[PDB]
C-alpha cells in the first residue's frame, strides 16, 4: 500500500460529504451534522476536541490537507467496531437485522446523497453477497471496512 491518485480522489469525495457549504473547511457544525446522521450526538466539547487534534493552523476547522493526512495515516487502535455498529443501527431503523432498500435510501438522503433507484439497487446488490435481497450486519461490515 502506498498513497494513490484513486485514494486521494475517494478522500476528497468523503471530505465533501462533511463540507456541506463547499467552502473548503469542516466546521464543528458540519462535523456534528454528519455525526448525528450516523447515529451519534456529540457534545460541543467533543467536537472542538476532535477538530483541534487535526488543526495545526489553529483556525478551529479541518482543511483537506489535514483530513487527507488523517485518512491516509497508518493507524491501529481505533473504535471502528463501535462506529460501524452504531451506523448499522441508524440504517436498520426497525431493528430486524437487515438493511432494506428503503432504509438505505433514507439514510443516504440524510447524508446529502439523493440516490436514483438504479444507484440504490446497485448499492444493495454490491453488499448483498449472500443473495437474499437485503444487507445483514456481516455484509455491512464488509462494505464499511474496504481499503
Amino acid at each position: 500500500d502506498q498513497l494513490t491518485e484513486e485514494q486521494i480522489a475517494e478522500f476528497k469525495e468523503a471530505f465533501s460529504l462533511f463540507d456541506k457549504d463547499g467552502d473548503g473547511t469542516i466546521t464543528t457544525k458540519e462535523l456534528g451534522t454528519v455525526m448525528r446522521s450516523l447515529g451519534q450526538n456529540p457534545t460541543e466539547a467533543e467536537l472542538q476536541d476532535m477538530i483541534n487534534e487535526v488543526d495545526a493552523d489553529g483556525n478551529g476547522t479541518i482543511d483537506f490537507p489535514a483530513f487527507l493526512t488523517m485518512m491516509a495515516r497508518k493507524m491501529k487502535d481505533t473504535d471502528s467496531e463501535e462506529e460501524i455498529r452504531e451506523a448499522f443501527r441508524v440504517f436498520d431503523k426497525d431493528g430486524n437485522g437487515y438493511i432494506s432498500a428503503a432504509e438505505l435510501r433514507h439514510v443516504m438522503t440524510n447524508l446529502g446523497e439523493k440516490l436514483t433507484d438504479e444507484e440504490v439497487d446497485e448499492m444493495i446488490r454490491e453488499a448483498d453477497i449472500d443473495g437474499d435481497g437485503q444487507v445483514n450486519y456481516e455484509e455491512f461490515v464488509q462494505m464499511m471496512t474496504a481499503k
Binding site: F11, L38, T78, D79, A146
Partner: peptide
C-alpha cells in the same frame, strides 16, 4: 463501490478523529 466507499470513509473519519 463508490457510494459504499464514501459512507465507509465518513464512518472511518469519525472514528479516527475521536481516537486521535
Amino acid at each position: 463501490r463508490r457510494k459504499w466507499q464514501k459512507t465507509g470513509n465518513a464512518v472511518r473519519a469519525i472514528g479516527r478523529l475521536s481516537s486521535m
